Amino acid sequence: QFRVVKEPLGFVKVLQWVFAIFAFATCGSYTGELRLSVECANKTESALNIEVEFEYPFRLHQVYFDAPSCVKGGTTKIFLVGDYSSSAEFFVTVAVFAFLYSMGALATYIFLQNKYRENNKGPMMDFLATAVFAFMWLVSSSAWAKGLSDVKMATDPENIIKEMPMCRQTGNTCKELRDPVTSGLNTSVVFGFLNLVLWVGNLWFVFKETG
Amino acid sequence: NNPEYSSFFGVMGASSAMVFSAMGAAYGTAKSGTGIAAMSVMRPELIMKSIIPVVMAGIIAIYGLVVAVLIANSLTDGITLYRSFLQLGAGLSVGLSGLAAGFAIGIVGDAGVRGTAQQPRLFVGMILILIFAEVLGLYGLIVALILSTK
Amino acid sequence: NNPEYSSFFGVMGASSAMVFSAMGAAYGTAKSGTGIAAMSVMRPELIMKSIIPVVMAGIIAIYGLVVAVLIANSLTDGITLYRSFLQLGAGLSVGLSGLAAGFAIGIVGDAGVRGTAQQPRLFVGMILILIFAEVLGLYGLIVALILSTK
Amino acid sequence: NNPEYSSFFGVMGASSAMVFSAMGAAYGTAKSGTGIAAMSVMRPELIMKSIIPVVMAGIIAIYGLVVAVLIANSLTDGITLYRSFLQLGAGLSVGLSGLAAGFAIGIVGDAGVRGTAQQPRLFVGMILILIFAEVLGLYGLIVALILSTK
Amino acid sequence: INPAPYTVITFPFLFAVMFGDFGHGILMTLFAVWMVLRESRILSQKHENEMFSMVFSGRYIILLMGLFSIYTGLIYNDCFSKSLNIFGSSWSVRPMFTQGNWTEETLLGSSVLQLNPAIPGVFGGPYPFGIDPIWNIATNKLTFLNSFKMKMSVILGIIHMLFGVSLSLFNHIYFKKPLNIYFGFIPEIIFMSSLFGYLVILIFYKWTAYDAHSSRNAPSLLIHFINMFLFSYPESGNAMLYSGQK
Amino acid sequence: ELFRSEEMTLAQLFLQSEAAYCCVSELGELGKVQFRDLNPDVNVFQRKFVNEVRRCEEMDRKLRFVEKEIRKANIPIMDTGENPEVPFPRDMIDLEA
Amino acid sequence: AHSFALPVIIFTTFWGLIGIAGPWFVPKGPNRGVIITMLVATAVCCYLFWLIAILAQLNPLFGPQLKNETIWYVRFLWE
Amino acid sequence: LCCGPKLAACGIVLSAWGVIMLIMLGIFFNVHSAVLIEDVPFTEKDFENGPQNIYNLYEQVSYNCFIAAGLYLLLGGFSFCQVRLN
Amino acid sequence: LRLWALSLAHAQLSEVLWTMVIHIGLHVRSLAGGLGLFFIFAAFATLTVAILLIMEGLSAFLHALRLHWVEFQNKFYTGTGFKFLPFSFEHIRE
C-alpha cells in the first residue's frame, strides 16, 4: 500500500536508515597523519620528515613509528598511547546492528502491513526495540564523543615531544612539521547526534500511532 | 660447570614415571581379567559390569604418561643437576604409586567382582572401595607434579 | 661453602615419605577389601558399616601426603645440607609408620569385618583397634613434623 | 669434549627396547597358547578365533622393535652425551613395558579362552580386556618415541 | 533433616571445581540437554543398557553439573587449555618495562627469558575476572597458581563442614537433647573454629597486608602455623604479622 | 525452615469382611496405604485364601502358555486400555475356566 | 589499572540482591523452602569463589615468566 | 533404510560440534589476528624486520580451518540425507 | 585438597592434550597443513571426549560422592530410619 509509505511513520524509518549508514560509514573510516622533524646537534643524525598515520580502530597503544635515537646515528621505536577502540569499535558495531534493525523495521512497514495492523502488535515491539536502541545509542555515542575528545587532547605534538628523553636533550629539538586533522570525526559525531534526534522524534510519533 | 650428562637423573625419572606404572596397570588387568573369565561362566549378562574396573585401571597408565610426556618435552642439556634430581624423585614417586594402585585395583576388583557375581548388592561397596585406589594414585601424581614443578 | 650433592636427602625424603605410605595404602584396601567382599556376599545389610577401615587407609594416605608436600615445598638448590638431611629422615620415618599402619589396618579390618557378621559384639573392638592403627600413623607424623622444622 | 664410552647408552637402550618386550611376548605366546591347546578338546570350532591375544602380543613386541630400530637409525658415535641417554631411557622403558604387557596379555588371554570355551558370550568382552593391555603397551611405545627423538 | 536439597547445589559446585573447564562443560551440557529434549521418546523406549538408564534418571543432575562446570570454566579462565582474553590484562606495561632499566634486554633475551620483577613502581592492576591470561602463557604459572588453589580448597572445605556441624545442632534442637548442646555442638564448634577460623583470617590478613615491598624476608603461612602448633616463638627468622600475636 | 520426613501415624481400619474386600479394592486402585501384617506367625494355608492364590497362579501360568503361543503366532498384542478399571465379581472363576 | 572497589561493589550488590530478594518473591508452593535454599546456596557459593579468586589475584609477589619471542610480540602488540 | 540414524547420529552431532569449533577458532585466527597469548604456536624463523610477515601468515592460518569447516558441513549434509532415508 | 589435586590433574591433562595433538597440526604449509589438521583434530575430538569427559568426569562425580558421604554426612546424618514403602500397584508398566 502506497498510503502506508506516504505516512511519515515509515518515511522517518527511511530517513533513519539513510542517515545511520551515513553516520557509521564515516565514524569508523576516517584517516589522517602528522609528520615530525628532529633538529639534532649532529646534522647526520637529524631528521626532517617522520610520517605517522592513524586510522580506525584508533588503537594508538598498538601504533608505532621510528625516529632517530640522537645517539651515534641509530634509531628507536616510539609507541603512541591510548586505547580508543574500546569506545569507537563498540559504537560502530552498535550503529551497524541497530541500522540493520532499522532496515528490518522499514521492511515491516513495506510488505507486512497486514501483520503490522494485526492487533497493533507491530507498533508495540517496534517501539520497545527502538527505545532500547535509542538508550544504547545515547550511552555509546556519549562515550565515543568523550573518546574523540580524549583523542583530540592526545594528538597534541608537544606532549609526545616532551615525553621523550632524546627530545629533551640540549641541541636535539623535535618540532612537528605537520599537525594532524580530525574534521571528519567531527562530522561523524554530528551525524550521530542527528541520528539520535531523529529516532527520538520517531519514538514520539510511534507512541502517537500506538494510542 | 655443570657435571657430565647432567640430565640423566631426570631422564631416568621420565622412565620411572611410566615404568612402574606399566608394571602396576599390567598387574591390575592381570588378575581382573582372569577373574572376569570366571564371572561370566554363570551370569554372562554382567559382561558389561566386567568393564567397570578396567576402564579405571587405565588411569594408572594415563598417570604414567602425565609426567613422562611432560618431562620428555621439558628436558634440556644445560641443567643445574638439581632439577634433574627433582625429576628423578617425581618419576619414581608416580611410578611406585602406579604399582600401589595397580596392586589394589587388581586384587580388589577381582574380589569385588566375585562378590558381585554372587550378590548384586555388593556392587555399591565394590565401587566405593575402588575409590581409594585412584585416590592413592592421585596422591602419587600430586607429589610428582610438585617435584616436577618445584 | 655448602657441600654439593646435598639434595639427595630431601628430594628422596619427600618421595620416601609417600612411598612406604603408598604401599601401606595399597595394603589397607587389600585384605579388608576381600573381607568386606565376603561379608557382603553373606549379608548385604551391614555393607555400609564395613567401610570405616577403608577411610582409615585414606587417613594414612593423608599422613604420608602432608609430610610429602611439606618436604617438597620446603626445598631449594643451595641448601645447607643439614635441613635436607632432616627432611630425608622425616620422610623415612613417616613412610615406614604409614606402612605399618597400612598393614595393621588391612589385616584388622578384614578380621573384624569377618567377625562382626557372626558376633555383633566384635564391631566396637574392631573400631578400637582401627583407632590404634591411626594412633601409630600419628606417632610417625609427630616425629616427621618435629624433624621438618628443627 | 664428549666423554669416552658414550654411545652404549643409546646402544643398550635399543638393545633392551625389544629384548624385554620379547620376554613379554614369550610369556604372551606361552600362556594363552597352552590354554588354547587345552581348549581345542571340547570346542574345535574356536581354535582359529582364539588367536587374537597372540596377534596382540605380536604388536606388543612390534612396539619395542620399532623403538630399537629408531634408535639404530639415529645412532652415531659423535653423540652430545645427552641424546644417547634419552635413547637409553626410551629403550629401557618400552622394553619392560612390552614385558609386562605381554605377560598380562598371555595370562588374561589364556583365562579368556577358558571362559569363551565354557561360554561363547565371553568372546567379545575378553577381546576388549585384551585391548586394554595393548593400549598400555602403546603408552610404553609413546613415551619412548618422544624421548628417542628428543 | 534431609540433606538432599543442600546436595542439589553443593554437589554440582564440587563436581564443577573437580571438572573446572569451560568447553567440556559446554559439551556435556549439550549432552544433558539432548537427554532432556529426547525425554518423551526415550521414556517410551526400552533401553537394556542399564548405564544409560542410570545416567538418564539423574539427567537433571547432569544439567546442574554442567551449568556449574561452565561457570567454573569461566572463573578459572580455561577452555581447552586456553584462557579467555577480555583484553583487560592491564598489569605489566611492556614499553614501560623497557623504560625500567631494561635497555637492549633482547640482546641477552636471545638465549634467556628474564622474568619480570615485582613492584617496579610502574606495574599494578588486576584482571576483570579469574586469572590474567599472561599467567596462561607463563612458566611461573605452576608456582603461582597451584598455591592459592591449595588454600582455596582449604577454605571451601572449612565452610562446607561448618555447615554440616550446624545441621547437627538443628537435629539437637528438634529432638530436645540439651546434653547434646552444652557438652555437644557448642564446645566442638568452638574447638574447630578456634583453629580454622583463625587460619582463615590469618590467610586473608597476609593476602591483604603484605605486598612485594616486603617480599624480601616476608612471612610464611605454614611456618607461622607450625610456630603456633608447637609453641615455638623464635625472635627472628620470620616476619611477624602483627604485634602481640604470640 | 528445616525439611524433614513427612509425618507418619499408622491407622487401624476396622470394617466388615465384604466391605473390606471393596475397600481394599478401592485402595488397590488408589495406592497410598501400606498394609502391615499383624499375624506374622500364620502361614498361607491358615490365612484361608491360599486356594484363591493357587488358582490365580495356575491361571497365570496357563496365560503365559497362551502368551508364548501368541508370540509364535506374531500378533501385535496392543494392550492399550480398559485394563486398570479391574472389576471384582466372583464370576472371574468361570472366565478362568 | 582497575579500581578494586568497582568489581567489589558490582558483585556484592549482584549476588547479595539475588540471594536476599529470592525468598520475598517465591510463591507459596509445595517447594518454596526448597527453592529458596537452592538459590541462596548457589549465590553464596559462586560469590565466595569469585571473591577468593580475585583476592588471590590481588597484590602480586612476582611477575610472569615469558619468552623473548613473547617479549617481541607483546612489545609490538600493546602494553 | 540405507545408513540409518542408529549409525549416523554420531556423524550429525560431531559435524555440528566441529563446524562450531572451526568457525570459533577461525574468527580467533583472523579477527583477533591469532593473539599469541591465546595461540602460541607459529612457524617462523626470521622476523627481525618486523611483524608484517606474521600478520600475513595469520591470513593463511585462518584459511587453514575453513577448509575443514566446509568438509564437516558437507559431511553433516550427507549424513542428514542418509538419516532422511527412512 | 583432593579439590586442588583433581583441578591440577584436569588442567595439566588438557594442557598436554593441547601441546601434543592440536599443536602439531599447525604448520607453515598452507594446504597440506589444513589437510593434516582435519584428521589431527578428528583424533583430538575423539580422545578429548574419551579421557576427560568420560573417565575424569566419572572420577570427579565419584570423589564428590565420597566427599558428601564422609566429610559431610558423618556429622549430622546420624542413625537411620525404615524405608517407607507405600503400597501401590507399580506393576502397571510391569
Structural domain boundaries of chain D?
1-150
Residues 6 or more apart in contact with residue A80 via CB below 8 angstroms: A52, A54, A60, A61, A63, A64, A154, A160
Contact list in G for residue F3 (CB cut-off 8 A) is 33-34
- How many other CB atoms are found less than 10 A from the CB of residue E185? 22
Label residue E25 left, alpha or beta by phi (over 0 means left) and psi (-120 to 50 means alpha): alpha
Q: How far is F1 from chain G (nearest CA, A)?
A: 7
- H-type helices in E58-185, by residue range? 59-76, 94-99, 105-109, 133-136, 141-175, 179-180
Calculate ∠ Cα C113-C116-C119, nearest 5°: 155
Q: How far is B38 from chain D (nearest CA, A)?
A: 6
What CA–CA distances, in Å, run from G70 to C105, E172, G65, G79, H43? 54, 61, 10, 12, 14
At B88 the three-state DSSP class reads helix
Closest chain B residue to the Cα of I14, Cα to Cα:
B66
Task: Please give the radius of gyration of chain A, using alpha carbons only, rounded to the nearest integer.
Answer: 24
Are the C-beta atoms of A82 and A60 separated by less than 8 Å?
yes
What is the enclosing helix (H) or strand (E) of C40? helix C31-42
What the block records as the C-alpha cell of G20 is: 536476599
What is the enclosing helix (H) or strand (E) of F2? none
**Is H37 in Cβ contact with E83 (below 8 Å)?**
yes
Contact list in F for residue E2 (CB cut-off 8 A) is 3-5
Interface of B with E in 42-61 (CB under 8 A): 48
Residues 6 or more apart in contact with residue C101 via CB below 8 angstroms: C24, C28, C56, C60, C63, C133, C134, C136, C137, C140
CA–CA dist A172, E234 (Å, integer): 60
**Is E27 in Cβ contact with H37 (below 8 Å)?**
no
What CA–CA distances, in Å, run from G30 to E7, F9, G33, G42, I33? 19, 21, 8, 20, 60
Q: How far is I32 from chain E (nearest CA, A)?
A: 24
Q: How far is D92 from chain B (nearest CA, A)?
A: 8
DSSP of A27-94, one letter per residue? HT--EEEEEEEEE-SSGGG-EEEEEEEEETT-BGGG-EEEEE-SSTT-EEEEE---B-HHHHHHHHHH
Contact list in B for residue C74 (CB cut-off 8 A) is none
Place of cell 572451526: H22
**Measured distance between the N- and C-terminal CA atoms of chain D, rounded to whole angstroms:** 21
What CA–CA distances, in Å, run from G74 to A69, E78, E93, E120? 22, 21, 9, 18
Amino acid letter, I16: V
Please, which chains are in contact with D (at least 3 CB pairs closer than 8 A)? Answer: B
DSSP strands (E only) in F1-85 = none
Q: By what method was this entry solved?
A: cryo-EM
Contact list in G for residue E8 (CB cut-off 8 A) is 38
Q: Do chains B and D touch (3 or more CB pairs under 8 A)?
A: yes
Q: State whether the Cα torsion E164-E169-E174-E179 is positive or negative.
A: positive
Are the C-beta atoms of E114 and E103 separated by less than 8 Å?
no
**Is E134 in Cβ contact with H38 (below 8 Å)?**
no
**Is B7 in Cβ contact with D85 (below 8 Å)?**
yes
CA–CA dist G7, B73 (Å, integer): 40
CA–CA dist A95, A88 (Å, integer): 11
Calculate ∠ Cα F69-F75-F76, nearest 5°: 140
- How many other CB atoms are found less than 10 A from the CB of residue H66? 17
Q: Do chains F and D touch (3 or more CB pairs under 8 A)?
A: no
**Resolution of the model in angstroms:** 4.3
CA–CA dist E19, B97 (Å, integer): 23
Tell me which residue of B66, B53, B52, B67 sits closest to B12, measured CA to CA. Answer: B67
Nearest CB among I8, I17, I18 relative to E146 is that of I8
Q: How far is G18 from chain E (nearest CA, A)?
A: 16
Tell me which residue of E175, B17, I2 sits closest to C65, measured CA to CA. Answer: I2
**Is A64 in Cβ contact with G78 (below 8 Å)?**
no
**Is B66 in Cβ contact with I12 (below 8 Å)?**
yes
- Residues from A in contact with G at Cβ < 8 Å: 59, 61-62, 64, 83
Closest chain F residue to the Cα of I84, Cα to Cα:
F34
Nearest CB among H44, H60, H71 relative to I30 is that of H60
What CA–CA distances, in Å, run from C24 to C34, C42, C64? 16, 28, 10
Nearest CB among B22, B38, B69 relative to D136 is that of B22
Q: Is the peptide bond before D44 cis (omega within 30 degrees of 0)?
A: no
Q: State whether the Cα torsion E162-E167-E170-E175 is positive or negative.
A: negative
Backbone angles phi, psi at E98, to 5 degrees: -60, -40
Residues 6 or more apart in contact with residue F94 via CB below 8 angstroms: none
Q: Measured in whole angstroms, how far is the alpha carbon of residue H46 from the centre of its chain?
A: 28
CA–CA dist F58, E79 (Å, integer): 64
Contact list in I for residue B137 (CB cut-off 8 A) is none
Closest chain E residue to the Cα of F4, Cα to Cα:
E1
What the block records as the C-alpha cell of E58 is: 539423574
**Is G65 in Cβ contact with E139 (below 8 Å)?**
yes
What is the enclosing helix (H) or strand (E) of A174? strand A173-178
Does the CB of B57 have a partner CB in chain C at under 8 Å? no
Contact list in D for residue B7 (CB cut-off 8 A) is 82, 85
What the block records as the C-alpha cell of I34 is: 589444513
